[model samples]
Target: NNLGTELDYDTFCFYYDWYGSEAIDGQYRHWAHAIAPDPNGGSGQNPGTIPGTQESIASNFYPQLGRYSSSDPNILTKHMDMFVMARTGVLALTWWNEQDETEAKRIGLILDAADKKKIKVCFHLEPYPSRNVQNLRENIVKLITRYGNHPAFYRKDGKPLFFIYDSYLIEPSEWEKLLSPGGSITIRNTAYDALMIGLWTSSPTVQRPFILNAHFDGFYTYFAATGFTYGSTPTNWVSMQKWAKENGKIFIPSVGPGYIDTRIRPWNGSVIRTRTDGQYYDAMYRKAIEAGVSAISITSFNEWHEGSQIEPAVPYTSSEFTYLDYENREPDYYLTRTAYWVGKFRESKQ
Candidate 1:
């Protein structure tokens, strides 16, 4: 199924909720995020701009496949092909809740498509409404019961892996009530036991308690913007790795092709990270490999709203805006570019 090619499981990509009515699922709610006033000027309105079929969508770059539904099997297969082409082995799919059927079916189709390419799928647990440790444990059991046996479900050393976004939102004591071995409703060694990873967004001093007290097995920096936080800064990764080693934890540094979310946060131009015609991506990967990390997570595979996707994007100009592309390179240039770095990372491991 993988054409006799072995995927390097150490490298991962963050996949997102790909829904919408050609723009957003159900309504133009996500697109309406752009309606706010842009502090930098020339953007936003009272009701905000809900991009229609004509104007460029709410992103600095446009997808090569155009506005498509995530539920489409063809699109899912194509996405899998691109990830395989990029040599990406693991996908961290965003999971919001256990009850949403739309999210559930999409994840099901993703696992099916990913299994064909030997790409593994893991969960990136998002902070849904009223999220707490108790419900989290229940949800884990439900998820594992439903999909844990699937070949595409990712695992390491006989345990599932979960990346918890905004893990610091919950108190460490609250987390320990579930993650700690002696806690009342612990899942430490049971069937749903997983290598839980929490997001690292601040300095070591501020984040140490969250990592240690919460009993997280690891940490990851999810933001694509270089200086957005100490966690996301590439220069700090080596030291971060040293700390992880000292503390006996896994530290995964995330890389991105670039970042430009002006469409969504029109006032946040200062956070933009330039792609520099592939230089930024190469540099990010170089730093991560140099840090000697056990694994590297990509900020996104297709977070179009954040302009952090490595998925193929096409150049286009609409009446209101001109979209960014790979500087006249082929649409699949990023996929090939990612594969190059992935090869380098694999070589470093050897």
Candidate 2:
């Protein structure tokens, strides 16, 4: 019943929950469920507790909570299923600068799984300031040699797909020179299939020339409307779709259930309390269809910090907050219902 096209929706669940010490050891970890204040005397809040403590902590509490490691099979299998089986095509796994035993183990699992399921995986490597060229190149080599030939890895024309989250970090000229002949000696041996560059702002056009120089297969600009600034409204979606279409590139509009980072970092900004749950998601689905996006990437499958998590949570019983609270006042109920609509939309397009 599954269509064999790579053009489909992609989402992430539990951001980095699986890699934590508790998660890796096969222990059921639900830290985010137990909210608490920032440990550093800072204001950030966290959902889970330490392995042996009754105290709950925020994401930033343990500097190492989200760090990648491959030593644990439980962690690997958990994420493998979470991302690969949830969508039709490839899914991206988040990564940072440091690689350790856990990361190595995770990579091994990916290679093993790639051979078995024929599913491709992409790494959402954060841009510089968070990650550097040396570490980035090192990890890329390890990834390519491990999974490049696998069918699940996305490719353009005939190459593998790689992506960087932020666009402002690297300059246009620097990117060109690195890809040019004998300029950056490190990248010479590390080739990619395709590159997906992400733009998270309104002024993406200003960086258009810089992006083109990177020689990416395509670029994705995030257009979500849940928070105070952009609210993921239909208007923002229409504008983003127009921009993508006019530029002749693949459009990937982001969708989210809602946002509320205020609980974690009050000074970060005010909570976006505009749209009810149903209205929020319905608007996103409709926009995806209208824009004819090559693919719809959910803002998150599980990013609880910002209340954008699609995964069910406590007090949030049943993932039906929108319908139960507002009654078909909008449309759809479960987050999965939105996904079902996406499936139907994609089918109709075909």
Candidate 3:
């Protein structure tokens, strides 16, 4: 059993806010996101609906636990247990910045729970307001200084790990100052040195150079929708891996059960990837395995808005809309599938 010992393989899943219920703060936060009208045969400029309460939440799928708070001790415990059962080695928490006191406290609670379950927590740093190379150095220092010592804070080979989302927004020249070894504010080999993994959201011709020039040690495709970008497409991963090997860099390909965001952006039907009774998930895992990737990142654990979540969901119908469910499958089907693929991945390594 790999109970106390760290596993050789890394399987990360993106996790988001679980504390937006009225019980927590007397109002809904994310669950009340505006739902745009169906675009139909034209542009989606038509008005739609917004959830005034939990009964009409803004998601295509409803959680099995109903509207729950992230601060709840029981919910946090169950989440950690679920992660362990799925063999998810790392929990990539969506972090905007340290200034958000609410999310910061949520991270604290998640870390405590993860520590108990022997799970590691890593930061998926979202592009915050006015983010640049200048303040980025200070932000990294702040994050590391605060959560660096935590037992659940994920580390690889004695260095912390960070997944920078939408990294392409910042030009490589700007990033070089912080990531490059010789740059002015370089973090390389410094007290805050870490494995800075950037998001590759474009074609190899454009992104490969950015990664190299920025001096990032690795890159990951964050999108769950297949073919959404060159990096997210599974077919490109094999060649990408070859290139990464030549360049001495790490390449992580992300996978997901499927994709659907019609609730929020009703006009985005073309990008919808149907779950197909879990066949989609199986297909993605097969491709990742065939590509022979060292690490795999799941699209999300509880991003209900995007409908890419692997978290437990239930079938529910309200007066307004009906939420989808895993047809003829258990609520924990995705979790079980995760364990199955993770086990296969480990066996392949052996």
Candidate 4:
């Protein structure tokens, strides 16, 4: 039997209203849901700015609005409170994709609000897959300077937390080279509590070197749809947790409600299939506990476009055959239930 019961909701920083409208009470709502600006802004001119009209605005508009604007503090506070109330301990502040001081300042404001609410924040670092070392370092510095000492920052031994996505995307030697003598050693002064290195099971050997040289505080095993559905079984999580524990490293096991990324990838690839949301949450919770995970990250709270959103659009019981039939459920029904299980897991374990 699996022992881990803690569940953390992983959320993308995309705002729905900025990109498309959502309908409520037979009326259309146009305000961006969570994200201030769409990360997809700045592509071109806005052909349609009218309500309910799909326009081709600059893709930069979304990222700029969310990251750089101060138009709606209350809007941000409300969203942040929703996540905090749901018992989400960690709030990953999107990506460090842009290398701008102004953008970092905007994120700082958001972090300030999160800190006031006592939520932990993780700076999700996105190193360009092609390996742009210079840009990566510059961006990291800006992020640390702007939000390093914020109250909401995730700390290890009294320092803020930082995370890198796609560990295998960068060569191990290059990672060391950049952090070592000649590169961006200034990160040490940035007051980082822990550095989370991402792993996708493809490169088992990269773990030790990263730990040895970079001094990462933990390892987040990235089990995507392909890896979980076809490459490994739920039992694999058990084995990986043992390896992490023996090495004296923290392992954040990840679970997805479901995945269908046909928009970004070819449809021929394998996908995790399930008809019900409860089964998906249960399977992940069981495996994470069985693996002895200290922390478990859910794939997402909202990734509606990819279809893994857990924000209740409908109330679903195991007996319900179709999702549409379950529409009467409260919007937060699934999220609260998942958190309830987390609390129960902690209580039983203690």
Cα lDDT of candidate 3 equals 0.84
Instruction: For candidate 3, write residues 1-350 as lDDT tens digits.
Output: 56533333388899986447787756776778776656465564646566746567777888897877777768889998889778898999888774867777888999999999889998888889988988888988988999999999898889888899999899999999999999899998899998888998888889889999999999999888999988888889889888888998877788999889888887798889999989999999888877877888899898888889899999888887888988788899998888888887776663
Q: What TM-score would every model get versus the actual structure?
A: 0.93, 0.68, 0.94, 0.67
Summarize candidate 4's per-residue lDDT along 1-350 as a digit string, tens digits.
Answer: 24343224332222222122233212222322222222345455333332322221111111112221232456557656666555666766557464455454556656777667666677666555454545666666656666666666666556555556665566655565445444444344444224544554544464556654654556665343425521134666666667677776667766655555332222323664342636665776567667766666655554443445454443222231222311333556556755665664455353
TM-score order of candidates, best first? 3, 1, 2, 4
Per TM-score, the best of the predicted structures is 3
What are the RMSDs of all candidates, in order? Answer: 2.9, 6.8, 2.4, 8.8
Runs with alpha carbons beyond 4 Å of true place in candidate 2: 2-88, 110-119, 128-138, 179-191, 222-239, 242-248, 269-275, 316-335, 348-350
Q: What is the C-alpha lDDT of each candidate?
A: 0.86, 0.49, 0.84, 0.49
Q: Count the backbone clashes (under 3 Å) in each candidate.
A: 4, 23, 0, 20
Q: For model 2, state the Cα shift of residue 324 in Å.
A: 14
| Model 1 misplaced stretches (Cα beyond 4 Å) | 1-5, 21-47
With candidate 3 superimposed using the best TM-score fit, by how many Å does residue 326's alpha carbon deviate from the native? 0.7
Extract clashing residue pairs from model 3: none
Query: Which candidate achieves the best lDDT against the true structure?
Result: 1
Model 2 scores worst on lDDT over the 10 consecutive residues at: 315-324
lDDT of 1 by residue, 200-317 (tens): 9999898987899988899999998898999998999999999999998999889998999887677778999999898988998899999999999998898888999999998889
Deviation of model 2 at 302, angstroms: 2.3
